[PDB]
Amino acid sequence: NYSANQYEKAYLPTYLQNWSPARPTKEKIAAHEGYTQIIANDRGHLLPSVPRSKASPWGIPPAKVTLTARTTTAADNLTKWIHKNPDLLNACNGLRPEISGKPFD
């Protein structure tokens, strides 16, 4: 799930025709010291001590908009009319749009 090196043009949505960006990637790591012990028994059963992402994942009004210049009261509502929807903010292909704009005077 890392991004490759140098020849960074042969794998892009240019060929995927992807209209929701795949996944953030990187080329970096802190030098990992560590014996890389085993904290499973036979099943990936974490030894009760070691922590994990403790049952976090287990298994329409939002839209890309620039606030630009539309009346602030409407603009204020839109921001709320975008957010407060974790059913479309969190996971399962990403579910998170973008936003832009500028205020009024």
């Binding site: 890392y2 490759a4 090196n5 140098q6 020849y7 042969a10 794998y11 080329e27 790591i29 030098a31 990992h32 010291e33 560590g34 014996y35 890389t36 085993i38 904290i39 499973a40 036979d42 990936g44």
Partner: protein, 427 residues
């Protein structure tokens, strides 16, 4: 006189050698049957470096095929030059690999190493005085890692005075097919760094990119991938077989190439790769050769040391050249590319010229590089183990084979060393 005996290991090496050996025979002009057609005296004279003599003008290759799967060796035997290969040299086993490093390293290797050592020593006694040995296999290869790591260890005590050339291909970083493929690598490279003196590192993704970049032909054969690496490995051997004012010994090369013992991993470089129109749209001159020789695209091994810096560089030029164009281009590439190299060592350029051009092109060359671009490789190699040995996935097999988690720990600690070594020396 001094000769080289070859070892064919793993199924890739089965495809590698088949293309490599047909290149040599066709380069030297021997027919598929084996009756050499006398056309060049120099290739007539310097055939003894690699081949022995059979009756009726037959040049027996001094290579050894080892495998486990008959179909691969059945296929290559039916291949264009299986006839010039020896059933005496066809050694293999009665077992299936499972792509298992441990089975080919402790279980299956035990009963076959005896025979293969007999075969090579019979070949070793057949010849007079070897430079050393070269080895075609894969580091991610399931059984080639199994056999070679065993064999290289045994040869180390057998002949610790010869050249242990190793030719291995790095599997695709983005795509590995085999999932235990990383595990096989660290198992192998742990002994490899201990035993090898030379190691070529090659990756298929660049090969796809180069076929993309210059072959232009969309859909190649994997044999074409063999066909180009066979050309590269042949170029370094042109020095030995061919005349011209160039010193050819790999030790000659290695002592100029290896500043410190742990340096075994090297990247190749080759000469004109030409497109359909550019054959007649190219003015074949050493400068544009020198430009193409040093191209961020012309490389094929891992990636550009654009990330890092240059430690040692050695370029061999095959064809009708002169000492000045290489010198001024070296001066050109010196003044143009000076401080990217480590200030540790200046003038670490190593040049040799083979006056004898290849059969098909005249102005040609080969480059071998040792720069600071291998960090990303074993850095890449580093994470997945820490990811998968984190939870010992697919491990009950190797414990069943009699292996322990501990053996991995020194192997990774050994590579954890070499990350710092590559880092600390350059950075």
């Amino acid at each position: 006189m001094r000769e080289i005996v070859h070892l064919q290991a793993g199924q890739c090496g089965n495809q590698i050698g088949a293309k490599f050996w047909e290149v040599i025979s066709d380069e030297h002009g021997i027919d598929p049957t084996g009756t050499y057609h006398g056309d060049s005296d120099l290739q007539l004279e310097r055939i003894n470096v690699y081949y022995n003599e059979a009756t009726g003008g037959k040049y027996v290759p001094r290579a050894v095929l080892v495998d486990l799967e008959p179909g691969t060796m059945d296929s290559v035997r039916s291949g264009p030059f299986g006839q010039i290969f020896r059933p005496d040299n066809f050694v293999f086993g009665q077992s299936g690999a499972g792509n298992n490093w441990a089975k080919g390293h402790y279980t299956e290797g035990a009963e076959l190493v005896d025979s293969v050592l007999d075969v090579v020593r019979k070949e070793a006694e057949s010849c007079d005085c070897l430079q050393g040995f070269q080895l075609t296999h894969s580091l991610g290869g399931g059984t080639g890692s199994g056999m070679g790591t065993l064999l290289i260890s045994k040869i180390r005590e057998e002949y610790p005075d010869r050249i242990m050339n190793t030719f291995s291909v790095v599997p695709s970083p983005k795509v590995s097919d085999t999932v235990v493929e990383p595990y096989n690598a660290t198992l192998s490279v742990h002994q490899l760094v201990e035993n090898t003196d030379e190691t070529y590192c090659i990756d298929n993704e660049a090969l796809y990119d180069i076929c993309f970049r210059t072959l232009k032909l969309t859909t190649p054969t994997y044999g074409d991938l063999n066909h180009l690496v066979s050309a590269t490995m042949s170029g370094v051997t042109t020095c030995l077989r061919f005349p011209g004012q160039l010193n050819a010994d790999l030790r000659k090369l290695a002592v100029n190439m290896v500043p410190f013992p742990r340096l075994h991993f090297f990247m190749p470089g080759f000469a004109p790769l030409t497109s359909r129109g550019s054959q007649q749209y190219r003015a074949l001159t050493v400068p544009e050769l020198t430009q193409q020789m040093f191209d961020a695209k012309n490389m094929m091994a891992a990636c550009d040391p654009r990330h890092g810096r240059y430690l040692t560089v050695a370029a061999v030029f095959r064809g009708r050249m002169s000492m000045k164009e290489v010198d001024e281009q070296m001066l050109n590439v010196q003044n143009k590319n000076s401080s990217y190299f480590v200030e540790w060592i200046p003038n670490n350029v190593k040049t040799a010229v083979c006056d004898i051009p290849p059969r098909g092109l005249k102005m040609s060359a080969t480059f071998i590089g040792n720069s600071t671009a291998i960090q990303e490789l074993f850095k890449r190699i580093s994470e997945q183990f820490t990811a998968m040995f984190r939870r010992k996935a697919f491990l009950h097999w190797y414990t069943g084979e009699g292996m322990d988690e501990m053996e991995f720990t020194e192997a990774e600690s050994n590579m954890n060393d070499l990350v710092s070594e590559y880092q600390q020396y350059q950075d």
